[PDB]
Design brief:
By secondary structure, the protein is an alpha+beta fold. It has one domain: Metal Binding Protein, Guanine Nucleotide Exchange Factor, Chain A (Beta Complex). The strands form four sheets. It has a four-stranded antiparallel β-sheet with strand order 3-4-10-9, with no helix packed on it. The longest helix is centred in the middle third of the chain and has 21 residues. The radius of gyration is 18 Å and the shape is elongated. It is found in: Cytoplasm. Its main location: cytoplasm. One of its GO terms (molecular function) is calcium ion binding. Belongs to the TCTP family.
Length: about 170
């Protein structure tokens, strides 16, 4: 029920309606489940000439999708290996300033903890993928999608430093 949004440019990055766990480091984890819904194509809010919506006569088009991405229309975008270093570097520094203006005591704990997680993320930045909200900003809240140690549990992480809690 809790709603967490970013102030830099995340806009509703995740919520507790699913489940959130903060790792000893400084990030939250919102688990997502798969649900089957009847979708008949969308392609943005308008962008098609003429169609029939028939395809076959033995299946309409049921597609399972995460409940967090569907409710928050999460939008995953492609990225570059070297481009990732520039986004995490200029983004980490951006937060460093937000602490100095708000809480300067979070500058050191945030640097050491965030530095450790970044080192374990580069080991497989591809397996963590890179998501982005409708804001379309490579310097806003960045969420990564990774499967637990099992693989049957899809979960994403949201930097707690750039995540606030909102009560209904």
């Amino acid at each position: 029920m809790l709603l967490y949004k970013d102030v830099i440019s995340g806009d509703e990055l995740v919520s507790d309606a699913y489940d959130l766990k903060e790792v000893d480091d400084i990030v939250y984890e919102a688990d997502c489940q798969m649900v089957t819904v009847k979708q008949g194509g969308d392609v943005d809010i308008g962008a098609n000439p003429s169609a029939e919506d028939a395809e076959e006569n033995a299946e309409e088009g049921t597609e399972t999708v995460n409940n967090l991405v569907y409710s928050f229309r999460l939008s995953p975008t492609s990225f570059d290996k070297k481009s990732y270093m520039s986004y995490i570097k200029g983004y980490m520094k951006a937060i460093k300033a937000r602490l100095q203006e708000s809480n300067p005591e979070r500058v050191p704990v945030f640097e050491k903890n965030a530095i450790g997680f970044v080192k374990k993320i580069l080991a497989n930045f591809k397996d963590y993928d890179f998501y982005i909200g409708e804001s379309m900003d490579p310097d806003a809240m960045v969420v990564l999608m990774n499967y637990r140690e099992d693989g049957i549990t899809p979960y994403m992480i949201f930097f707690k430093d750039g995540l606030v809690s909102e009560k209904f």
